[model samples]
Target chain A: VNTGEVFCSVPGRLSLLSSSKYKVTVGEVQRRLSPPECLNASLLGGVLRRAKSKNGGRSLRERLEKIGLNLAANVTLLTSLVEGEAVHLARDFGYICETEFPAKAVSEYLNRQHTDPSDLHSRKNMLLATKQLCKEFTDLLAQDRTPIGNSRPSPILEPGIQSCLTHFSLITHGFGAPAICAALTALQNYLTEALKGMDKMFL
Target chain B: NTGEVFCSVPGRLSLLSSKYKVTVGEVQRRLSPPECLNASLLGGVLRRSLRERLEGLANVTLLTSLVEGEAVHLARDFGYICETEFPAKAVSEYLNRQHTDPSDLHSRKNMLLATKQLCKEFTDLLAQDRTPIGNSRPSPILEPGIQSCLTHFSLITHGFGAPAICAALTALQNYLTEALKGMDKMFLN
Candidate 1:
């Protein structure tokens, strides 16, 4: 229940690093990840996350691998949470959180407040609320900046989350929390990439 | 005056034909005093009179038949005349000449044909009442429909040949259609 403990855990640490606070040099991350292709905004966000985590004393590669794994898990969790909702709330959340820092950042920022074990459940709710807030933020972002054309941009990272979610959802028989997390991570990376100019100019 | 012979035959029982020659001697002509023969008048009058007389002798039925025959001959000679004059020749010739150097005609033609065929098909659909004509210009509705169908088929067949460009066009079209629909609804409201 210790919010700090969760934040310091592999996933939280990875999230903070990805959140762009530590000013982890973009070049250093690029060198480490050596992304097969150019780093887009989303991928750049992931790199920044990894860098920030590494700078904060976690091994860069280890943090990334953890991020990837956590991404896979979150994707599953979120997918399940959103099932049968008016909209695919988890999916929307993943996109918004990934594209913008509204949800994950807010959740992490809020979770940072809960240090005592007695506040564990509160921290978890805060995290969930953060995810929900992220979803609403994404919906708003989509409304504001959705491109004028028929299809969206390339290298859509949401599909990866959905895929990861689907993979675990089946394994866990519709438990979507992990899947949701993975989607959020991916979305987080995407948003980070956007802030760092990794994403292509579209709106 | 020289004499000429005339013959008449009547045979009841004998069945005989006879030729007879009659000769007449020239009578002495009267010696008239010098009178005005008007030679100049004869020269002018005679030529004009002859021409008028000959022209009057022409057969009306024969001239009409001659003209009809000429018309039939021309009609029979002029096959493919209209097709030869078709305006498409210029475009075809330009394409042929350009094909030797740099040929985009095939692709261009494909695009043009696709657009045309789409228009035709959609028009057919509109005629059948399968789809509503939502816009003032059937073109906006038609182009987007064709582009959408082509885009899907293109992806299935050739994965992202032009990629985002084509997709972008489609997106713009959709946005435009939606905007137009919204505007129309606003007007109605």
Candidate 2:
């Protein structure tokens, strides 16, 4: 029945960065729940639902551990809510970038093992496939950037699209051919920018 | 006779030289085998043997046998068309390029396009009943029917690989009877 909540805050300065609550739309809440941040649960289980039925904090810790992330107790409880949110969001963003956008497919497709460098036809074919994958990624990103609305919650991620994305990597240092290396670097930068965009949206 | 008797005095040395004259066979022997059995000797042997044997009895008899057979003439036509117009080499190359490097997506796409184009051209040539690059025409309607069947097979199995080729070959067999039936018209005309 209810979509979003209204909260109030007092502004201050000089060792007085104190309590504040923000009202946000369901779209905003959903965006925050989505990848690159994935802060889908709240400690108090207010408007935002808790992630588990019981032993919530322990469950959260276990989930993060499963995802190869450590849930720091101090970061969770000691830090101010605002600072903690920022810290958690940033950590999650880095984790997703490292784990998800691996870019292996891009590297393999461009490498000598995939196609003979001397063979023009083979090189051309590889390039075409690369172009198609790149196009698909671009298109998926555009698709996910749907207009913010409460009537329909946008999808968190398309698994297929995410799988395709994972084939890419940030490391573009060494591969024999310079042009292809540059192209790989270009793809890396493109994905980085898109992921950054998502992180900002979630924030 | 008296003039001839006087000739002995002017060229007595020439009469001695004439006594020492070499025969043609001896000259040939000097240029010939064993120690001198190089290319020239081998070449001469080959040339002698390889010369036209049409005039010989065995060759003439063979020629008569070859010419006498109606089946031989039929085979000659079939052989010539198959050699020239069957598109075996093209099909083989297409298959080779296809299976050789499947990861080559662009080539994969282009090769299929090219194959379809080849089918179209071949079918058109057949339907028109025109002479292909071959010396003789294929029997009317037969070539067209076979070509259409092949084209259809190609479309149906459009994805990739040996199975498609197998189907094509099977289809080829089916139409071949028609091709033979159509060839009957060649003799009829």
Candidate 3:
């Protein structure tokens, strides 16, 4: 009963889940899943680098809000939300697809996400667009006499064009060419590499 | 009005989150937003509302706004549709729009170099603190849990979901469990 909305413990599937769900070396459970591990491998993945020069790493801080927070009242906290409500799933699949599922989620969670109207100002977007193309991006030259890191006036033709090809990250999905081009390129690369890894591991 | 809109937030924020109503208040008082309970529970109800599901889509949409992971992962795992188109422009409210300052990059890398750096960067952001859900305005807990495809990567990634959001909360709950277990130890010692 505690599993709530999404998760369910497939007891028969227990071996697969407990043994190798994460490792897939297996996936299980008869009941819903129990609890989660606070600490996991992401502990050392990648910290937003070089933000110290910009916003003093507000991006990094935004991601760390849950660190010191804990709960003796954890049970009440989760249960309360379940108190009153009325709302299920062939529906959910499309929802995932709508957000472009793994793709949209991927784009949104990318170390630096791109927002609509294409906020060209924020540190996250700046770092990303700058890195993807070249610091000497024409836009940078206009932004300052000497932009930080002295990367301005940089001169790269190919990356400059490539960056143009990479439009907005979280821009509109269905219509525009720039947005589609941006998401699809990244999505395409993600899928291609993932396909290879899966073929190697499972097949 | 935004605050008023939340007043009708189905979960009854003030009542449920008040000292007597919210457990987190009992433990400690801070930015204790009603995320795990109100938002998370709403995720479940929507997952299995059976026939009334469509009629209740508005609530789900609202809840989804509050908790992206709940809407994204909850509904997907429950299985119904596969894809839905999003209004990135509409959701852009959460993004920063003012500072157009230029940043620096020491050198440019090839596609291989850039992609490699990007991938490593996301992995760190995801693992560390799930990125902020809204602009840094809302409480962090209300933010989406890091739901990266790469965390488990596809197919096998936490494929067998457990106790719903069991593990992430487990991180915090264990501290209480340990504290309770050690209390006697402190007395015994």
Best by lDDT: 2
How high is the CA lDDT of each candidate model? 0.26, 0.28, 0.25
Better of 1 and 3 by lDDT: 1
lDDT of 1 at B178: 34
Q: For model 1, how does the per-residue alpha-carbon lDDT over A133-184 read when each residue is reduced to its tens digit?
A: 3343233223321111112234332443334323322322222232234333
Each model's TM-score, in the order given?
Answer: 0.15, 0.21, 0.20
Q: Give me the runs in candidate 1 sitting further than 4 Å from their true place.
A: A1-203, B1-161
Task: Tell me the docking grade of candidate 3.
Answer: incorrect
Off by over 4 Å in 2: A1-23, A26-117, A145-203, B1-189
Name the docking class for model 2: incorrect
Clashes of each: 35, 6, 43
> Distance (Å) between predicted and true CA of B173, model 1?
2.4
The interface RMSD values of the models, given in order, are: 43.6, 40.4, 17.6
TM-score of chain A of 1: 0.20
Residue B40 in model 2: shift from native, Å?
99
For model 2, the chain A TM-score is: 0.29
lDDT minimum window of 10 residues, candidate 1 chain A: A74-83
